[PDB]
From Swiss-Prot, chain A:
Full protein: residues contained: 3 to 103 of 131
Bilayer topology: Multi-pass membrane protein
Subunit structure: Component of the ER membrane protein complex (EMC).
Transmembrane intervals: 2-20, 42-61
Any Gene Ontology biological process: protein insertion into ER membrane by stop-transfer membrane-anchor sequence
Function: Part of the endoplasmic reticulum membrane protein complex (EMC) that enables the energy-independent insertion into endoplasmic reticulum membranes of newly synthesized membrane proteins. Preferentially accommodates proteins with transmembrane domains that are weakly hydrophobic or contain destabilizing features such as charged and aromatic residues. Involved in the cotranslational insertion of multi-pass membrane proteins in which stop-transfer membrane-anchor sequences become ER membrane spanning helices.
This protein's name: ER membrane protein complex subunit 5
Family affiliation: Belongs to the membrane magnesium transporter (TC 1.A.67) family.
Single GO molecular function: cobalt ion transmembrane transporter activity
Localization terms from the record: Endoplasmic reticulum membrane; Golgi apparatus membrane; Early endosome membrane
Gene that produces this protein: MMGT1
Cellular component GO terms, alphabetical: early endosome; early endosome membrane; EMC complex; endoplasmic reticulum membrane; Golgi apparatus; Golgi membrane; membrane; plasma membrane
UniProt keywords, alphabetically: Endoplasmic reticulum, Endosome, Golgi apparatus, Magnesium, Membrane, Phosphoprotein, Transmembrane, Transmembrane helix, Transport
Disulfide bonds: none
Segments in the Lumenal topological domain: 21-41
From Swiss-Prot, chain B:
Organism whose genome encodes this protein: Homo sapiens (Human)
Biological role stated in the UniProt entry: Part of the endoplasmic reticulum membrane protein complex (EMC) that enables the energy-independent insertion into endoplasmic reticulum membranes of newly synthesized membrane proteins. Preferentially accommodates proteins with transmembrane domains that are weakly hydrophobic or contain destabilizing features such as charged and aromatic residues. Involved in the cotranslational insertion of multi-pass membrane proteins in which stop-transfer membrane-anchor sequences become ER membrane spanning helices.
Subcellular location: Endoplasmic reticulum membrane
Name of the molecule in the record: ER membrane protein complex subunit 1
Disease: Cerebellar atrophy, visual impairment, and psychomotor retardation: An autosomal recessive, neurodegenerative disorder characterized by developmental delay, intellectual disability, hypotonia, scoliosis, cerebellar atrophy, and variable dysmorphic features.
Subunit structure: Component of the ER membrane protein complex (EMC).
Family named by the database record: Belongs to the EMC1 family.
Length: 101, 50
């Protein structure tokens, strides 16, 4: 369904928010200068979950596969279509006379 | 009087108001992730309002 597309959007948004959080946390260190050297569990969990949902949505957004066997889409092609030959059309048929000229 | 200075040292200026809160919210280390998300979003709204 189309909602899949919407899903991926929020995923990116989630990732974007993670970035902001990470940036802020970096400022934290740039003002604390302590031996933490570790991201908050909340931000990494949020980033990983956003990655998972965004990838799952993207896989759907990629599209639908197509079968290799050439007789798949040609199965429904009745003989009433392949014979038309659009380049070799002739307009000397009963259609013109029968219909309004 | 500053003609004859004996010793001097450089002391860093205090942190600005826009950066003071970045050292207060850190270090809480809440057990539950819900509290961490709550305080992070509260800080985000505070920054957005500012
Ligand atoms: C993925 C995008 C990364 C997320 C943003 C992280 C970030 O770096 O967040 C911090 C900045 C706040 O920078 P500032 O204006 O407060 O300081 C500027 C000081 N001054 C005005 C003197 C130049 O916010 C920002 O989005 C950074 C703005 C440029 C990066 C966004 C472009 C990608 C879309």
């Amino acid at each position: 369904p189309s909602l899949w597309k919407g899903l991926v959007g929020i995923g990116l948004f989630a990732l974007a928010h993670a970035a902001f959080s990470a940036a802020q946390h970096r400022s934290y260190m740039r003002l604390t200068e302590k031996e933490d050297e570790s991201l908050p569990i909340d931000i990494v969990l949020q980033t990983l979950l956003a990655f998972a949902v965004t990838c799952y949505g993207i896989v759907h957004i990629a599209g639908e596969f197509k079968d290799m066997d050439a007789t798949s889409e040609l199965k429904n092609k009745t003989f009433d279509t392949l014979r038309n030959h659009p380049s070799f059309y002739v307009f000397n048929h009963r259609g013109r006379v029968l219909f309004r000229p | 009087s500053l003609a004859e200075v004996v010793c001097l040292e450089m002391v860093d200026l205090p942190l600005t108001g826009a950066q003071a809160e970045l050292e207060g919210e850190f270090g809480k280390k809440a057990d539950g992730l819900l509290g961490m998300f709550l305080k992070r979003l509260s800080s985000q709204l505070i920054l957005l309002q500012a």
